[PDB]
Amino acid sequence: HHHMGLNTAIATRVNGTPPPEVPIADIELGSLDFWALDDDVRDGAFATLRREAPISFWPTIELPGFVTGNGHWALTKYDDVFYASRHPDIFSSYPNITINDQTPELAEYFGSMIVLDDPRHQRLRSIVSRAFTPKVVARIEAAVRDRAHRLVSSMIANNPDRQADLVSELAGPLPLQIICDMMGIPKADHQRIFHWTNVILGFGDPDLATDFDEFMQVSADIGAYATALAEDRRVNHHDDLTSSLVEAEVDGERLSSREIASFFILLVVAGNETTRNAITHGVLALSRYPEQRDRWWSDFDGLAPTAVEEIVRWASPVVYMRRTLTQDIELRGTKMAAGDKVSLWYCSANRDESKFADPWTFDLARNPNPHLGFGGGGAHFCLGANLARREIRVAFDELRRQMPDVVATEEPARLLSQFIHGIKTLPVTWS
Ligand code: HEM
Numbered sequence: 167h168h169h170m171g172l173n174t175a176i177a178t179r180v181n182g183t184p185p186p187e188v189p190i191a192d193i194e195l196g197s198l199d200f201w202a203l204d205d206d207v208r209d210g211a212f213a214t215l216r217r218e219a220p221i222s223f224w225p226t227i228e229l230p231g232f233v234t235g236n237g238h239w240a241l242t243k244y245d246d247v248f249y250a251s252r253h254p255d256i257f258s259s260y261p262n263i264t265i266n267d268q269t270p271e272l273a274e275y276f277g278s279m280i281v282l283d284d285p286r287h288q289r290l291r292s293i294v295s296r297a298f299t300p301k302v303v304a305r306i307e308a309a310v311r312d313r314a315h316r317l318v319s320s321m322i323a324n325n326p327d328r329q330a331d332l333v334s335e336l337a338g339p340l341p342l343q344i345i346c347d348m349m350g351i352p353k354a355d356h357q358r359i360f361h362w363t364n365v366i367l368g369f370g371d372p373d374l375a376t377d378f379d380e381f382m383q384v385s386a387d388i389g390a391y392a393t394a395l396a397e398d399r400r401v402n403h404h405d406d407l408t409s410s411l412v413e414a415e416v417d418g419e420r421l422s423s424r425e426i427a428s429f430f431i432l433l434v435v436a437g438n439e440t441t442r443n444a445i446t447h448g449v450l451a452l453s454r455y456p457e458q459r460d461r462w463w464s465d466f467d468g469l470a471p472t473a474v475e476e477i478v479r480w481a482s483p484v485v486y487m488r489r490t491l492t493q494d495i496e497l498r499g500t501k502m503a504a505g506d507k508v509s510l511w512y513c514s515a516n517r518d519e520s521k522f523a524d525p526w527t528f529d530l531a532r533n534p535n536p537h538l539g540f541g542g543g544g545a546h547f548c549l550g551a552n553l554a555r556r557e558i559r560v561a562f563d564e565l566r567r568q569m570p571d572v573v574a575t576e577e578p579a580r581l582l583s584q585f586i587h588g589i590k591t592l593p594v595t596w597s
């Protein structure tokens with residue numbers, strides 16, 4: 167520090183360091199306050215559970231407007247999360263995939279294929295899945311590239327002090343534009359969409375929304391938007407996913423307005439509130455472990471496949487998904503009852519010491535890397551996984567190309583969420 171100035175790269179950390187030991191008595195998965203604690207507390211809590219109570223029961227976190235809910239069995243081991251994901255006849259995605267349940271009012275907006283089992287779930291998924299296949303994603307690679315390139319160049323041109331928030335200037339707007347363009351949403355409305363999806367998956371964080379009436383107004387507003395755009399596409403076809411939604415028939419039946427709106431919402435919410443956190447956590451990790459940045463930069467194309475997977479394993483942007491038992495089962499000597507909720511902790515599966523060597527090492531060469539960041543596999547395996555991998559790869563490639571020494575200057579402001587491993591802001595600087 168020879169001169170004081172506006173910033174200083176954040177502290178680095180020793181790669182491979184396990185979290186400080188968290189006593190099992192300190193673990194409060196049913197307290198919102200617990201989810202505000204830093205990753206070291208949270209990661210150490212799940213390490214303790216994997217060792218000492220790998221399946222355990224916790225209460226639902228109550229937020230304003232939430233339906234009173236029974237507790238949930240937390241599956242913290244990789245093998246259990248994998249098994250549960252692969253056996254939906256036992257571990258149903260109905261009636262919901264967060265720990266709390268939907269009100270009847272919310273079902274008008276959130277009753278999509280992600281809270282349905284087969285057969286209906288697969289019939290719905292097939293309406294859009296062609297757009298998400300690798301060969302079709304390849305067609306929009308150039309657009310993903312152009313968006314990332316323009317955003318990083320704008321960071322440089324419009325921040326002459328050479329600092330900016332990575333989330334608002336790259337990590338958020340790159341995946342936002344891509345998924346909204348796939349839906350056919352005009353660019354003028356993308357920021358409106360993003361505000362809505364930020365609220366939908368930010369509820370309970372004071373920086374996003376805590377008033378349930380505001381949450382219900384946002385849900386109604388994005389639903390009305392979806393419906394208005396769908397009515398547009400009913401009269402004038404475009405080559406976008408909203409047109410695919412309104413033109414689809416399942417066994418001779420069009421989708422209802424409810425079904426179209428919830429499908430639209432599912433797609434933009436998932437597209438907007440996942441990859442941005444993989445990217446932001448990735449930049450945080452590069453800032454903490456510069457030897458990993460240096461390695462990747464010296465061989466970007468060679469390491470990119472494994473680097474992208476390790477960023478998803480490290481970030482685990484979706485912390486968990488819920489299921490509901492259709493029958494009694496016993497796992498690890500723990501009897502769970504038909505009708506009980508079960509939570510699949512991907513954040514924990516992705517540190518499981520029985521499955522991953524050196525789990526606390528951010529290793530951009532890690533291979534194989536059978537992480538559960540996109541879920542355990544099975545019927546609901548992330549629809550956007552190919553697209554997310556390309557978004558992540560291109561974001562880091564443009565940072566490497568245009569501002570290779572980009573580094574965080576403050577610790578991230580973390581989203582208060584049990585479900586989404588969100589970073590709200592990440593100030594960065596570059597030369
Ligand atoms: C790094 C980024 C992402 C991560 C970590 C992620 C993670 C996940 C996870 C864990 C699931 C649940 C899987 C299961 O239950 O087995 C899921 C489902 C889903 N994701 Fe992704 N996701 C990401 C990006 C995206 C993107 C960009 C989209 C684009 C819209 C998307 C669309 C979907 C959809 C539609 C589903 C529901 C699939 C179904 O029910 O069949 N995801 N995702």
Ligand SMILES: CC(C)CCC[C@@H](C)[C@H]1CC[C@H]2[C@@H]3CCC4=CC(=O)CC[C@]4(C)[C@H]3CC[C@]12C
Nearest residue numbers: 232264266267268276366369431432435436484
């Ligand atoms: C992260 C993606 C892969 C999946 C996105 C799923 C989105 C579209 C939907 C499906 C079920 C929805 C949840 C239903 C329960 C609920 C009730 C509330 O009062 C707050 C908002 C929440 C917590 C909803 C937030 C948005 C969810 C999670």
